[PDB]
Amino acid sequence: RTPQEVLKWIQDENIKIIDLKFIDTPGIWQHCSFYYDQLDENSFTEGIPFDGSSIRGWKAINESDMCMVPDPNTATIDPFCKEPTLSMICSIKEPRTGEWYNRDPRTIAAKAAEYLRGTGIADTVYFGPEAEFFLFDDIRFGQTENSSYYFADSVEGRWNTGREEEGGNLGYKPGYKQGYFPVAPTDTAQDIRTEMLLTMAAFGVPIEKHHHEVASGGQNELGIKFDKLVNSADNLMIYKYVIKNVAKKYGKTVTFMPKPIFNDNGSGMHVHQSLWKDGQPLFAGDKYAGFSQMGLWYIGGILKHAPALLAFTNPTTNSYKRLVPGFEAPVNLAYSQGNRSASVRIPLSGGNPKAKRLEFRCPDATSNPYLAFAAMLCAGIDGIKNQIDPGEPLDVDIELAKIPSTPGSLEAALEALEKDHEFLTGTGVFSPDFVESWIEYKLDNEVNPMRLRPHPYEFSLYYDC
Amino acid sequence: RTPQEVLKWIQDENIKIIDLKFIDTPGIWQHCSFYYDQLDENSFTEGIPFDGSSIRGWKAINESDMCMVPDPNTATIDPFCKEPTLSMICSIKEPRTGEWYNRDPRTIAAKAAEYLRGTGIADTVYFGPEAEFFLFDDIRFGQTENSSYYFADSVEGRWNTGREEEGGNLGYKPGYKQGYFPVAPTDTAQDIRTEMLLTMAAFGVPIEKHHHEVASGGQNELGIKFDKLVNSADNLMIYKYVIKNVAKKYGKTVTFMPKPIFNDNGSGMHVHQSLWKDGQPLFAGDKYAGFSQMGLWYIGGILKHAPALLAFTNPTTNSYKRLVPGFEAPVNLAYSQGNRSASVRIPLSGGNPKAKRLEFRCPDATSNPYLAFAAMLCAGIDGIKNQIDPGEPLDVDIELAKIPSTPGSLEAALEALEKDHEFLTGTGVFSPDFVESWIEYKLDNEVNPMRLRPHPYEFSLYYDC
Amino acid sequence: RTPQEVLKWIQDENIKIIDLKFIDTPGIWQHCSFYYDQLDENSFTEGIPFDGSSIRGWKAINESDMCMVPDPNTATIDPFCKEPTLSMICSIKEPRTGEWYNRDPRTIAAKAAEYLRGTGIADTVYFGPEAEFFLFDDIRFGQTENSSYYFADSVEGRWNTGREEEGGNLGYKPGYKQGYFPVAPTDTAQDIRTEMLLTMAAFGVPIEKHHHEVASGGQNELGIKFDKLVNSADNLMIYKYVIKNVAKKYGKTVTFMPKPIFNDNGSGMHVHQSLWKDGQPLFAGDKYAGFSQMGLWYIGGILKHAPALLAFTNPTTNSYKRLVPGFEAPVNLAYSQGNRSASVRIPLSGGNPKAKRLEFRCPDATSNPYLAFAAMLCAGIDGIKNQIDPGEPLDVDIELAKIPSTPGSLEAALEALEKDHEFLTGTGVFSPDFVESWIEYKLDNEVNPMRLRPHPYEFSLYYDC
Ligand SMILES: Nc1ncnc2c1ncn2[C@@H]1O[C@H](COP(=O)(O)OP(=O)(O)NP(=O)(O)O)[C@@H](O)[C@H]1O
């Protein structure tokens, strides 16, 4: 689609409102709605003004003015608007320079794909994210000077087997770790997952499947096809938007947080990736697990830069409650085929070169997909260019100190980024300015506020002392 | 039906979602939904991937990847999906070998029918299961360190004759043991049972009848026609699925547990069986109760291997609360005609050779029908091949030590399986690997957790001591 | 007092019950009561048996049997027993060897004082602990799979200024950080603090003063005089016992946890210390702040070994919520006079050599005083023996990276103990066995369980992502 085709669309269908969407630095979709007459040919080049100082991690009040540039290829009707509204995904333009903004995650993402094409290694990188979530019926949290609390609830919750329910308690509550994937009446989310899957398809997302996940009390997963870097990060943002909004439609609440439930499965975002040139898969070969030496080298980079990569792929203190040794892994920095306990997994493809890829299991859905994907690409490329030996595969379950480990906290991942960021910066994709502001925002707004707050389990262990 | 006919069905009717169903080792139906484009000709041979390590009693995390192979003959529309969804029953393929998985109960089931055809004794085995259930209006259970509780409820419950009900208490609550089979207003489940019966018919199940059962407080039964081994175990899984899901539709809850109610009828799954060759009934003859010597020998095997058979036909600790001497039997290992107190019953057929069969009364609906049916077939065949004399019929009600008895607990049935499993393994149907993992899963997840937990009746007997 | 004088006491006053008290490894007082006839002359040498395998961090089930040896000098009447009960503090004897148990904190403490006397540096070490606490009216905490919560309450709590109270809300609730030290009706704890002070005096504790502390909602402090190492750690255990028990008497609850309240003062245990020989103060001199070179060197050791010392003086994850840069310090490893923002403070003595001492401000009341005091003594001695220059004093409020900092977590303090423990072990005071079991107990029972549990503030930051 083109700027003129989108403008013809608005005229023919008499669309009165345009909803322009764009991501912020941490990873939250922002929006502004406009009356149809506000969008012209120039909106697709010069962009539409807004305050860049109210968006987290961007401009300072003194240099506030920024521009929203919508992508015509993203235009669809937002089903969640009573009034027929056309929705587009934007990239951010600096009005002072007229160039794309260096802190815009969607700009960084495009720059990463431009860099890949520049090296001659490949022309396309396919990303296939797998974002698990929880479908909750209630959420109550807070923390005052004399209190700290959270209470998550779901009808599927095993903690609710003995409770009085309105007309009445119908049983079939999945047991802890026992939600993957018994039929209804255990699975209460079939109709909703199909709706979430079908509505995002109409948004332009390539859809595949859906299933109930391991955890009791609403853990679910929707399966979407891979796509090119920017397109894939655009697809994850839509994915997250429709799921949250269909949940709200049916009076429910969704969270993509890694560990909302203690002693049950966390929500991870396993990300499948492969490099391609002239339509041919470059990760197909005759080496380990039917991979090519390039594919082994891409894993090399991923595994070597994994601690730094975690500052972008697992950017929350909560990420580290899931990335704990034992439950359920991937804490250990190694590759393997079929092994779902290893950081990098080589799925078993049915002898098809087109299906040959690596699954980086460490990431979770709290990440900015534009930043996470660009970072993983950079580590991958550096791995082929340096030409990082991933070591030997580990084809076992659960001496364990011989294998390098992932950071155990957010500050540790931020430390690993300060030490190892040349594979990102030296490229031009991420600016040293952005990498520094990322560490600073995460330390001041997440690491430090958390260190200050008493944890309720500290009463369980320490009230008597 | 064929893979192409199913694919033509999806194209012509514009079916967007495909629901693939498969059983786990203990006996719970699992599922995964796919967008239409994910199912092609190759899905019917190579299968569709999934995690075999999250399914109870299967693969270990290190060797996780498995394949779902749908059966085209099982395709129907799942009525419980708002969105028109096509549903198929799968068998599990090992992607490493390309062969059918040895722990897949549906594979074991097919292997059992392949074995029967291999012996030349018969070409077909007809199984007619009779699974009673309870239709409850409420269920609350739990067990903490300082508590253990369950509270089952139904409007039909005799325990509710003196309670205040919303506008108001309409009486006609069946008395204990007095539910078989007074008319409405006593029987409150006529409309629902007809719906359960008619919807499963549309799923491809051969339907016969329905009635209210002996127990007060929702005991019911739906009658379905016999079918070939795999088809019959497929029919029982559908049977259980529609009943549970129509109950959920009308805000009610179903249990197939053997003994949910104390001092009232348990839920048993009487299983009628007969061998056939070239369309002719092989259990018709001029011996006892109009049976053939082969039929007498098949009973021989069943009765001889019955204690081991119970590790598969009655695989729960709760099974043994129903299989108690007195209420209501069949605890005594003997055959008889018309006698509903004997383990094996020869029903009175109207002088029709086609209706000549044995009714093994011991089983209950907690069993995996694929495992239970394959096991009973194996014991039957071994009985004809060895050529086990069933002894003499016992045509009496209620010296009693002269007759061999069934195990009194789950561990006892598991003990009997360790001692007597050659009739299963030596065949090739069940692998010694599967038989060992079955005992281990049942001991670690059911027998041992139960031995640890205080029973509320232990307070009734022992609080003062 | 002697074993015979204690036995004469029991006979003359007709005391029927004897309460023998002893500390466990983490720092909790344990007890066992005996009928008078059970205590004879041999109880004061051979000791009284008990199970050393049920006490945290001690014997294994196979080598369980241990002995309690009471100290006659600790005998007093426990006021909290309706029946006149004589109470004594014990040390633990190994019955296998007949020697004092190497994991007994009270034995380690005596060994530390024996070591000081062995070096010829001094004959006496005086410890003056200052343990702040909170006096709460209510405490509710818990953490399930779907929840985590704590709710602390007090009538003094500023969070309660707008609440309906029984007949009625009388105001005068101290403001946050504004509790030190307005008069009544603001201070509601005058009578109780006097009772806590007077009852511990009758227990044999040298008492000095009492005041309301900085924090709103019940923060209090009782002032006690210094004493010799073991005597001082005995005095802190009594201090903690009477405060908790007088609170219980008046239907209230006390906590010595470092940070129960967010955004208000933590509970610290500032510990004043000085070495003496032949009745003369050795920390009096003509150097900085009227100190001696020995005193400067003792600070040297303290400051150098402070990160390792924190594994014993601040042994909880909660300790690190108080030891946070800013609120209120001492995070910075430096000495100064009058400065209450420095780790080590030299209080202003009124030109009296007898009052010349250092105040290590880092410790909190979650510590085992026997372990904390022995550790600080060892670091002090090593400082004089090596002859560690403490650096130059920092006489400022709040470049800041030039000054060495304390660990930011419990694992970090445990890391610092593994690297620096020779000043403890090489001495003989702490065994390498004890130092290893300490790290292991803290990692397995506190550090690792905490890393697993979602924090409620993680919902505040991450629910939307
Ligand atoms: N060559 C490829 N390059 C990148 N992504 C791919 C490639 N092939 C498949 N994918 C995608 O990776 C994702 C994987 O889904 P799936 O096919 O179920 O693999 P999976 O490993 O079995 N999923 P899971 O079981 O949760 O780990 C999908 O988005 C696929 O489209």
Ligand SMILES: Nc1ncnc2c1ncn2[C@@H]1O[C@H](COP(=O)(O)OP(=O)(O)NP(=O)(O)O)[C@@H](O)[C@H]1O
């Ligand atoms: N020759 C046969 N082989 C196997 N099953 C059969 C055969 N004939 C009938 N059945 C089935 O066995 C089941 C028996 O139902 P039914 O006809 O009511 O017998 P029943 O003994 O009276 N039932 P019940 O009273 O509950 O024990 C049905 O599924 C029949 O289809």
Ligand SMILES: Nc1ncnc2c1ncn2[C@@H]1O[C@H](COP(=O)(O)OP(=O)(O)NP(=O)(O)O)[C@@H](O)[C@H]1O
């Ligand atoms: N020479 C000494 N050696 C060891 N301890 C001492 C010595 N002199 C006084 N102390 C003790 O140290 C503790 C200090 O209490 P205090 O006299 O109020 O000093 P402080 O610094 O003003 N207290 P604070 O304001 O809370 O820091 C008391 O236990 C004193 O007895």
Ligand SMILES: [Mn+2]
């Ligand atoms: Mn998943």
Ligand SMILES: [Mn+2]
């Ligand atoms: Mn998947």
Ligand SMILES: [Mn+2]
């Ligand atoms: Mn995955």
Ligand SMILES: [Mn+2]
């Ligand atoms: Mn029946």
Ligand SMILES: [Mn+2]
């Ligand atoms: Mn019947």
Ligand SMILES: [Mn+2]
């Ligand atoms: Mn029957």
Ligand SMILES: [Mn+2]
């Ligand atoms: Mn104080």
Ligand SMILES: [Mn+2]
């Ligand atoms: Mn003081």
Ligand SMILES: [Mn+2]
């Ligand atoms: Mn002080």
